[PDB]
Design a protein around this ligand. Structure first.
Ligand code: OEI
Length: 117
C-alpha cells in the first residue's frame, strides 16, 4: 500500500527550540528513525543557516531536492541524505533543511514536501 512518494507538511522548528537534536548514532539508524518519524507525523525540519549544524547532533539527516519539474500542490519532491564526519550517504539536490524529531515544539512555518519513500 506504500506509495513511492508521500505528501507531507513538516513543521519548521527554530534550532534553539529543538529538544531532541538528532535521530540516533549511526547513518543507518538516523535514516531509519527519520523515515519512521516522517511516517508517524513526528518529524520536524530545521532550516540550515550558519551556526545551525554545530547545534545539532551527528549523524545528520537532510532532506534534499530530488527534481526540478514536479511540485504538485506546493510539495517539492525530496529525498533523504545522511551526513557523518563530512561524508554523505546519498547524492541529491539542494538542502531544504535538517530533520529532527518533533516532540511538540511550536513551529514557525510548515514546509510542504513530496517525500520519496
Ligand atoms: O525506538 C523508537 C522510539 N522513538 C523514541 C523517540 C525518539 C525521538 C523522539 C521521541 C521518541
Amino acid at each position: 500500500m506504500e506509495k513511492t512518494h508521500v505528501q507531507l507538511s513538516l513543521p519548521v522548528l527554530q534550532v534553539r527550540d529543538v529538544l531532541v537534536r538528532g535521530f540516533g548514532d549511526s547513518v543507518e539508524e538516523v535514516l531509519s528513525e527519520a523515515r519512521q518519524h516522517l511516517k508517524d507525523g513526528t518529524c520536524g525540519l530545521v532550516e540550515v543557516e550558519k551556526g545551525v549544524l554545530p547545534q545539532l547532533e551527528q549523524p545528520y539527516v537532510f532532506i534534499k531536492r530530488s527534481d526540478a519539474r514536479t511540485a504538485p500542490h506546493g510539495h517539492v519532491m525530496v529525498e533523504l541524505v545522511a551526513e557523518l564526519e563530512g561524508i554523505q550517504y546519498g547524492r541529491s539536490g539542494e538542502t531544504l533543511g535538517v530533520l529532527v524529531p518533533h516532540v511538540g515544539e511550536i513551529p514557525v512555518a510548515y514546509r510542504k514536501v513530496l517525500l520519496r519513500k
